[PDB]
Ligand SMILES: [Cl-]
Ligand SMILES: [Cl-]
Ligand SMILES: [Cl-]
Ligand SMILES: [Cl-]
Ligand SMILES: [Cl-]
Ligand SMILES: [Cl-]
Ligand SMILES: [Cl-]
Ligand SMILES: [Cl-]
Ligand SMILES: [Cl-]
């Protein structure tokens with residue numbers, strides 16, 4: 001037993017490792033989206049940069065779980081980071097729809113971990129999730145949903161002018 | 174009788190209380206418009222913020238009537254603030270059309286109060302309305318009318334690209 | 347279903363709308379207290395300003411619930427804002443006693459909403475209440491209680507000199 | 520006829536001269552109050568300074584009527600400035616009560632002049648009164664009324680401690 005460990009269930013330790021992996025998986029998916037929108041035959045650079053930044057944020061989320069694991073006396077156990085589900089992402093609308101679903105998948109895993117922490121009477125882990133993850137996730141989901149609404153309004157997928165306008169006026173330039 | 178009261182007719186006092194209520198009603202309607210445009214399935218945030226700011230301005234108009242009532246020695250009497258006429262506002266054009274009509278309703282009440290003040294030979298109340306309300310109202314009506322003209326030019330309600338462009342280029346970002 | 351909605355029970359959505367209304371009701375009550383203490387025959391302007399500021403804070407609390415509702419994919423539904431229970435507030439002690447009871451009523455509604463969120467296993471809503479409302483409410487209740495103790499010490503309601511001194515030395519000038 | 524005169528009735532010209540005199544009379548009354556509160560056996564120096572400043576304001580009001588008369592092509596005609604009604608002013612409450620009545624007397628004369636200007640269809644004179652006099656008068660009346668309420672609360676005339684406290688905490692130090 002680690003000398004620091006106190007009130008930290010094995011099941012929570014394992015679930016933190018699985019969360020770590022999911023954040024890295026999300027990072028990798030966003031990096032694929034970045035590379036897609038940077039292609040010369042796609043060429044939506046503000047969209048590309050939105051996804052690149054989101055890829056970096058997900059890696060930071062993973063690193064924070066590594067630090068957490070060690071603070072509690074658990075042990076980081078890594079697994080392969082699976083490649084993203086697609087090699088090409090269609091257009092801004094398809095990518096944003098995939099991002100929404102990814103963020104909801106990550107959110108569900110965070111909520112499931114919170115429920116496990118509750119069941120194991122681990123208020124430190126509950127606080128960590130509430131203070132560092134759950135609100136960021138709700139904000140990200142709302143932002144992407146708002147974008148999808150605007151992309152539909154702009155006539156995606158068919159309306160290329162609408163897609164251009166979104167890249168120039170909705171995503172940080 | 175209040176020790177400060179001079180040349181202040183009971184009818185004017187009552188009409189100031191009714192005006193106070195109407196300004197609060199207008200504030201509440203604009204707050205509903207804010208919440209509508211902030212929905213994830215509407216997502217026109219500059220439009221939402223335009224209405225939020227207008228909601229705050231109307232509350233300030235109400236507070237100025239409270240202060241006025243007390244300065245003249247009248248007594249503030251509050252009534253329920255009725256909920257807005259609609260729960261959802263359609264789109265930017267429908268909302269702006271409703272805002273125009275609301276501003277004209279408020280303007281008519283201000284003009285009616287000015288006429289009452291004239292009839293009761295109350296130049297202080299006439300000056301207050303002319304100096305603090307009537308020009309602001311004309312300016313607001315002109316601004317909203319100009320917006321409606323532009324929304325129609327942009328093809329509202331059908332043209333979603335036009336609606337997007339209005340949010341990005343006509344309302345403060 | 348809203349595209350953003352996840353783990354948000356209909357009962358919580360409805361209870362957030364009812365909370366929104368209660369915050370607006372509290373705002374309106376404080377605005378009535380402001381207007382009362384600004385009367386020429388009351389004339390306790392620091393007390394009046396204390397209540398005016400509290401009225402603005404309550405409106406901010408309501409607006410934060412509107413934003414929350416939309417972030418979760420719920421729908422803001424507004425109801426009439428009922429007028430305050432009294433048209434005149436007696437004196438500083440009576441008003442502060444009414445404010446204490448109002449703050450405790452709002453606190454109880456917040457606690458009830460937290461219990462509902464707990465029952466529906468909604469940690470995001472629990473965090474929101476704990477981080478944005480519950481401590482502010484405890485602080486406000488303590489402040490008003492401290493004021494009541496001092497008003498009683500100063501001989502309210504009978505001791506007008508005590509009431510004057512409170513306005514000049516306990517409330518921000 | 521003055522080369523500048525246009526739309527300026529003889530009756531209004533005369534009434535402006537009478538107003539000029541009344542403002543000077545009010546100034547002189549306030550100067551008497553200043554001297555009273557500066558007596559060694561009264562010795563309420565913040566109260567004294569309040570009245571001294573008000574004396575200067577009234578003289579400025581008179582000078583503005585002189586300038587107005589000349590701008591319109593009327594002719595300033597001066598009369599004796601009558602001494603104040605009392606040689607001694609009792610205490611802060613009695614003085615403030617006299618000041619309230621004086622301000623209401625001046626207000627009534629301003630309102631009467633506005634009515635004359637209205638009857639003679641003189642919008643420039645109406646604007647001048649509304650823009651330069653009527654609101655200042657309402658503000659002054661409200662301020663003095665608020666003071667009287669506080670002096671009564673403080674137990675004037677009997678409560679000398681209350682009178683001391685008013686001088687130290689209600690009037691600019
Ligand atoms: Cl342990
Ligand atoms: Cl334990
Ligand atoms: Cl264990
Ligand atoms: Cl593991
Ligand atoms: Cl694997
Ligand atoms: Cl996918
Ligand atoms: Cl693919
Ligand atoms: Cl997914
Ligand atoms: Cl889990």
Ligand SMILES: [Cl-]
Pocket residue numbers: 117118121122123126
């Ligand atoms: Cl726990």
Ligand SMILES: [Cl-]
Pocket residue numbers: 130131132133134135136137
């Ligand atoms: Cl967070």
Ligand SMILES: [Cl-]
Pocket residue numbers: 146147150170216217218
């Ligand atoms: Cl957006």
Ligand SMILES: [Cl-]
Pocket residue numbers: 146147150170
């Ligand atoms: Cl957008």
Ligand SMILES: [Cl-]
Pocket residue numbers: 178179180181182
């Ligand atoms: Cl009257």
Ligand SMILES: [Cl-]
Pocket residue numbers: 180630631
């Ligand atoms: Cl009159």
Ligand SMILES: [Cl-]
Pocket residue numbers: 181182183184
């Ligand atoms: Cl009347």
Ligand SMILES: [Cl-]
Pocket residue numbers: 186187188190191250
């Ligand atoms: Cl009324």
Ligand SMILES: [Cl-]
Pocket residue numbers: 252253
């Ligand atoms: Cl009603």
Ligand SMILES: [Cl-]
Pocket residue numbers: 258259271
């Ligand atoms: Cl409507």
Ligand SMILES: [Cl-]
Pocket residue numbers: 258259260261
């Ligand atoms: Cl509706």
Ligand SMILES: [Cl-]
Pocket residue numbers: 274275276278
């Ligand atoms: Cl209307």
Ligand SMILES: [Cl-]
Pocket residue numbers: 188285286287289
């Ligand atoms: Cl009216």
Ligand SMILES: [Cl-]
Pocket residue numbers: 290291294295296299637
């Ligand atoms: Cl008039």
Ligand SMILES: [Cl-]
Pocket residue numbers: 303304305306307308309310
């Ligand atoms: Cl105006």
Ligand SMILES: [Cl-]
Pocket residue numbers: 319320323343
């Ligand atoms: Cl325009």
